[PDB]
Design a protein around this ligand. Structure first.
Ligand code: IPE
Ligand code: IPE
Ligand code: 210
Ligand code: 210
Ligand code: MG
Ligand code: MG
Ligand code: MG
Ligand code: MG
Ligand code: MG
Ligand code: MG
Lengths: 339, 339
């Protein structure tokens, strides 16, 4: 629990991030709206990505080099990752027609916001580079960070494209829901920005810029990302919204979920037809019918066994590729992800 | 007409831009969608911003330094500006609830596209930095260009925020439609990316990176941007869609248009009430009523006089601040904008 006490210290730095980003009186009204956007969307999460930057920074840099300004740049780059997340989620909730996020109504669903949330999400993305310029402009890793935040956006956007193309509204897409398709979607849409980006940001900030070390870390982190998305898909249906903070839509949205991939792999010809007639539709009785089929195929028990096989697999990859990084960097993140 | 012959040469370079951006078989389907997005949204315009990069590059660099690779980087940076435009317009058409753009139906209005256009617009933005990396990575102006494309996005997004905040759907906002408000909106939402960004990109590519020269060029270019937006607002209502390629929505969208600012400045107490009761609403009879009031206040004649006063003003600013740049750089763009 290296991030447990570090959680409140990280959140305490948000007020300054806002003050700096909310510092030309003509654009006053727009700046007031940006503060309102930041406060609604970048707060309320677990901050696992933002904290990973800070915790990984501390574990990779010698304390004699961890000065007040150096640490300030670490929390700031941590909050840049949280703004990247906030950008993706504001937009993903519109495209996934979501209702709630982190225990409250979706920013676009708020009266008086609507489709203006599209520009609001883009302002969240713009703020990353605004922060990187304000704090990392003179640093030798400045361009490496910008290129890493830009590349992470492209990877995710390419992943979202795959996600939306495999899930067309109104079209039976069971033929597309394969294991190979699934692994490509989750690698691009989640695994790069959620696991590779926070550790790589800390690595570049610690002067670790070698291609081999970044490739070795990536081998561990992308496999961890694959599990986090399988867990996210499992919780979309079998998770408690009081804990998850959001309401699942994967069945209604005809999404290439891990569960439907597992359903199709185990379904009898009769069970496939029930799935065909009820998947990808808005009717509650159809969604209920799909959830009834999943429970009949013991997919929650199939997920339990997967979590164990996956945990053992990621641990074998940490033993294989962690060096010369402290294994604590990868274990702390494994601890946050597995329960 | 320094861009007239240069138009077809610029468009001929698009096929390679697509081939390079559409060059991991797993993401094949997403890459096919990106090509479809590029071909629908980055083609059909006048390409004035993209051509300005190329024409300004030619006029600022000595021909002995204008090699095949150097020129290739110029057309590519020109197409980066066209992709920035395509990103903003795909998103602006959703938020402005537009029907057509460049003679065809809006990408989001297309059956099977919808709100997925949000991710499509973000992929267009991602492509800029993908291109800048592929062609300008080794150049000394690489970071200056990235920072200029990022800063231009923020400026525009801050401008769009002002634009949407001044135009709330369902609220009478005539008190907000002032000359001071108007000049702030158009400076941020249009003037920076449409006029400063193409010339500044060429300036950095020509090794002109001095703050004073960039400030002097900005003085001319932002004032030119203010006129281009006044002309855009005028054409929203009094322009021919066969020429403009789009259908005006400013009255229905309760936008802080130059015309409504001019209406309010000249309206009798009785005329103000007709505007109050009919502006910002979707009913055709209400929009017709507003257009009838504008024509009664001779706003098309008021625009004619403004275009002349503005032309004389921008020409005085070129005489004042053009040096040491060739005046041809600013005159060619003035020629494209004024008619
Ligand atoms: C990409 C994933 C699977 C979904 C959201 O991530 P988080 O679970 O980290 O959400 P927040 O804590 O930031 O709200
Ligand atoms: C920002 C302005 C005022 C609107 C669109 O610009 P253009 O008139 O340049 O549009 P395209 O030629 O690119 O279609
Ligand atoms: N990966 C971003 C958002 C998600 O994880 P979320 O379940 O909406 O939070 P998705 O399932 O849409 O991929
Ligand atoms: N500036 C971007 C788009 C516009 O010019 P357009 O008239 O929609 O092309 P707006 O009037 O919305 O500002
Ligand atoms: Mg989602
Ligand atoms: Mg999604
Ligand atoms: Mg999910
Ligand atoms: Mg518009
Ligand atoms: Mg607009
Ligand atoms: Mg307009």
């Amino acid at each position: 629990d290296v991030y447990a006490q570090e959680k409140q210290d990280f959140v305490q730095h948000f007020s300054q991030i806002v003050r700096v980003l909310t510092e030309h009186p003509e654009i006053g009204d727009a700046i007031a709206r940006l503060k309102e956007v930041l406060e609604y969307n970048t707060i309320g999460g677990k901050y696992n990505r933002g904290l990973t930057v800070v915790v990984a920074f501390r574990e990779l840099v010698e304390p004699r080099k961890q000065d007040a300004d150096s640490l300030q740049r670490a929390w700031t780059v941590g909050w840049c990752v949280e703004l990247l997340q906030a950008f993706f989620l504001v937009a993903d909730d519109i495209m996934d027609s979501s209702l709630t996020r982190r225990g409250q109504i979706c920013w676009y669903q708020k009266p008086g916001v609507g489709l203006d949330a599209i520009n609001d999400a883009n302002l969240l993305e713009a703020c990353i580079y605004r922060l990187l310029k304000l704090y990392c402009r003179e640093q030798p890793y400045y361009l490496n960070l910008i290129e890493l935040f830009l590349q992470s956006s492209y990877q995710t956007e390419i992943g979202q494209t795959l996600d939306l193309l495999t899930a067309p509204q109104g079209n039976v897409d069971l033929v597309r829901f394969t294991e190979k398709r699934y692994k490509s979607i989750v690698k691009y849409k989640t695994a790069f920005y959620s696991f590779y980006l926070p550790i790589a940001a800390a690595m570049y900030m610690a002067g670790i810029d070698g291609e081999k070390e970044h490739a070795n870390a990536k081998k561990i982190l992308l496999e961890m990302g694959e599990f986090a998305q399988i867990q996210d898909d499992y919780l979309d249906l079998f998770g408690d919204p009081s804990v998850t903070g959001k309401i699942g839509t994967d069945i209604q949205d005809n999404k290439c979920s891990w569960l439907v991939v597992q359903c199709l792999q185990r379904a009898t010809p009769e069970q496939y037809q029930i799935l065909k007639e009820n998947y990808g539709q808005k009717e509650a009785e159809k969604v209920a019918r799909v959830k009834a089929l999943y429970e009949e195929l013991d997919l929650p028990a199939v997920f339990l066994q997967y979590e164990e096989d996956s945990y053992s697999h990621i641990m074998a990859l940490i033993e294989q590729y962690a060096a010369p990084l402290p294994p604590a960097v990868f274990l702390g993140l494994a601890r946050k992800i597995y329960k």
